[PDB]
């Protein structure tokens, strides 16, 4: 309500990630803006520690579902905006089939007039010549459905979805996502009926930018309840 009101216009975003995969440490900073009226996010990420040791598409999901567009009839099911400005904790395990896994913990909250996603990522059991550390992912992204259920026992939501990563040999590498979101503030909140976020992502580059980087555009609309 008051939380939803914070998203009526364009909101600045900052993202910060500290990461360690198979011992390779790295850091990413991002900035951009979100317009939840349209379900639209635009971000730019720079690896501030040099070369990113994993492919950029593997971090798209880690890099703010409060910017989803919830249609009018579904607005009572938007956990993410209600929890603002105090925010929520998002945790994932991401299993790359026949490879290693990411574990992430993020806090998503407002710092001033800015929505901030601060993340820590640890990745283990990857193959040094597999698709991830070997950089065999196409620089692109497909559409997915993010399935959300209430987790009443934990005052939050649990989320599951499977990302399809296109590989340079024409194959597809599946990344199973297991996600939980818990409010940062205390007190029981209203939790949604089962629904999903229709998510579309487009990755691009700034051709003058010489640092290792990703430009990410996202379009996210909630769906899956009767109209």
């Amino acid at each position: 309500s008051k939380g939803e009101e914070l998203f009526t216009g364009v909101v600045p975003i900052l993202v910060e990630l500290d990461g360690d995969v198979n011992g390779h440490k790295f850091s990413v900073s991002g900035e951009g803006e979100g317009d939840a009226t349209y379900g639209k996010l635009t971000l730019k990420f720079i690896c501030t520690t040099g070369k990113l040791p994993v492919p950029w598409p593997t971090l798209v999901t880690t890099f703010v579902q409060c910017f989803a567009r919830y249609p009018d009839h579904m607005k009572q099911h938007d956990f993410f905006k209600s929890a603002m400005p105090e925010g929520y904790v998002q945790e994932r395990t991401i299993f790359f089939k026949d490879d290693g896994n990411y574990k992430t913990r993020a806090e998503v909250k407002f710092e001033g007039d800015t929505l901030v996603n601060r993340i820590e990522l640890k990745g283990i059991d990857f193959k040094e010549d597999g698709n991830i550390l070997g950089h065999k992912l196409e620089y692109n992204y497909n559409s997915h459905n993010v399935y959300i259920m209430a987790d009443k026992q934990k005052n939050g939501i649990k989320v599951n979805f499977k990302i399809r990563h296109n590989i340079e040999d024409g194959s597809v590498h599946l990344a199973d996502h297991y996600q939980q979101n818990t409010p940062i503030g205390d007190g029981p909140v209203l939790l949604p009926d089962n629904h999903y976020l229709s998510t579309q992502s487009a990755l691009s580059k700034d051709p003058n930018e010489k640092r290792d980087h990703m430009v990410l555009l996202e379009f996210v609309t909630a769906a899956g309840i009767t109209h």
Partner: nanobody
Amino acid sequence: DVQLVESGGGLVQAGGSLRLSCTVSGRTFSNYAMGWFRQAPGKEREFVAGISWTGGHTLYTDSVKGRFTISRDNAKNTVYLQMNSLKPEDTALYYCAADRAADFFAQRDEYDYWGQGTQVTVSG
């Protein structure tokens, strides 16, 4: 809480096909894992097919594998059971069932809610 109404049943010749429907009224359809069961006179209800709330995970009893398809339309409160290559042994009263989903999977049992059923008769 929720009410289930089956339809699409009838008589068809062995090798024919039928599409059953189950319409869910009341609470939010996407909250429920959905299943189809079938019963021959005097025998028990046996599980036929089950679908997760998301539609992404399905289960089938062996004897219908590759002939029946369960699917759902979460915006239309309906689950369907496409039954192809029907055999006389498929003759039965077909029940729709529902259960508040605990996770993202389908389930074979422990359904709380039941329709009255739609008759399917496969002539031999």
